[PDB]
Design a protein around this ligand. Sequence first.
Ligand SMILES: OC[C@H]1O[C@@H](O[C@H]2[C@H](O)[C@H](O)[C@H](O[C@H]3[C@H](O)[C@H](O)[C@H](O)O[C@@H]3CO)O[C@@H]2CO)[C@@H](O)[C@@H](O)[C@@H]1O
Length: 158
Amino acid sequence: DRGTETVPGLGQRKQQILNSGGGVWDLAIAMLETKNLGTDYVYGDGKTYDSANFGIFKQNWFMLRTSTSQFKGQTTNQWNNGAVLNSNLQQDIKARQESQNYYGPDKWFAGHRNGESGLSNPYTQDITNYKDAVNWIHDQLASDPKYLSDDTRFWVDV
Ligand SMILES: OC[C@H]1O[C@@H](O[C@H]2[C@H](O)[C@H](O)[C@H](O[C@H]3[C@H](O)[C@H](O)[C@H](O)O[C@@H]3CO)O[C@@H]2CO)[C@@H](O)[C@@H](O)[C@@H]1O
């Protein structure tokens, strides 16, 4: 199922994302990641090393260290270096955009959703379901410009 819900403060975050280099596409991805477009979920989303998640998109460390200028070349053991993305939105957005530009959208979705294993199996039903969910959210956000600044959240239960 899918739907809408009003989240106070959401329009502020939408506008900060869109004024920090993010596009409507970035907004759709982040809207699926968290309810509040925030970074205050549990540290690393409770995961460690290559599986740890950082930033408003919950990017994993494998992706960050393999495909972003800010962390390129870094090791699995260096995973705590990704925590800076939890309070630097500009670098967070740039990292995701760079990562998608390195891998391309299809493989970026696979690695974002399933890590390094996803890169070798990028068209599973689960990755496709995630891609279809982001696309649906994007199309709802694109359907009225009010959704770029109001407190409306579009959600999908992936
Ligand atoms: O698996 C994708 C992504 O999901 C994040 O969790 C999202 C859920 O995907 C879903 O959108 C969820 O929506 C709630 C919604 O907030 C409302 O309360 C409604 O009544 O019930 C739905 C149940 O789906 O919201 C969460 C974010 O809070 C998150 O788990 C990511 O790690 C994950 O990659």
